[PDB]
Curated annotation (Swiss-Prot), chain A:
Upper classification of the organism: Eukaryota, Fungi, Dikarya, Ascomycota, Taphrinomycotina
Assembly description: Component of the RNA polymerase II (Pol II) complex consisting of 12 subunits.
Domain of life: Eukaryota
Record protein name field: DNA-directed RNA polymerase II subunit RPB2
Residues of the full protein shown: 98 to 146 of 1210
Family stated for the protein in its record: Belongs to the RNA polymerase beta chain family.
Organism field: Schizosaccharomyces pombe (strain 972 / ATCC 24843) (Fission yeast)
Record's function text: DNA-dependent RNA polymerase catalyzes the transcription of DNA into RNA using the four ribonucleoside triphosphates as substrates. Second largest component of RNA polymerase II which synthesizes mRNA precursors and many functional non-coding RNAs. Proposed to contribute to the polymerase catalytic activity and forms the polymerase active center together with the largest subunit. Pol II is the central component of the basal RNA polymerase II transcription machinery. It is composed of mobile elements that move relative to each other.
Gene, per the UniProt record: rpb2
Swiss-Prot record, chain B:
GO annotations of cellular component type: cytosol; nucleolus; nucleus; RNA polymerase I complex; RNA polymerase II, core complex; RNA polymerase III complex
Native species: Schizosaccharomyces pombe (strain 972 / ATCC 24843)
GO molecular function, one term: DNA-directed RNA polymerase activity
Key words, A-Z: DNA-directed RNA polymerase, Metal-binding, Nucleus, Transcription, Zinc, Zinc-finger
One BP term from GO: transcription by RNA polymerase II
Positions annotated as zinc finger (C4-type): 6-26
Keyword Glycosyltransferase: no
Cysteines joined through disulfide linkages: none
Signal peptide (residue range): none
Positions annotated to bind Zn(2+): C6, C9, C23, C26
Residue range from the parent sequence: 19 to 63 of 63
Compartment(s): Nucleus
The family this protein is said to belong to: Belongs to the archaeal Rpo12/eukaryotic RPC10 RNA polymerase subunit family.
Name of the molecule in the record: DNA-directed RNA polymerases I, II, and III subunit RPABC4
Length: 28, 45
């Protein structure tokens, strides 16, 4: 995980990933 | 090559040119640089 501001200087962007449950059919 | 120092631990990382930036007995991946010797001329004004 990120620990800013120990980040920043690594010119790192401070985001998190999105996870959306997608439906195609296999119950889950 | 030279020595480097970590942001947290500070232990001597003494790591080699062109490799991977990190530490040894711990974690995190940054590092600053030891101050030179170095008796430096400083006026008191």
């Amino acid at each position: 995980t990120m620990f800013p501001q120990e980040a920043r200087l690594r010119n790192l962007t401070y985001s998190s990933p999105l996870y959306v449950d997608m439906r195609k059919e296999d119950e889950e | 090559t030279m020595i480097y120092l970590c942001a947290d631990c500070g232990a001597r990382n003494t790591i080699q040119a062109k490799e991977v930036i990190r530490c040894r007995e711990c974690g995190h991946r940054v590092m600053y640089k030891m101050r030179t010797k170095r008796m430096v001329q400083f006026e008191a004004r």
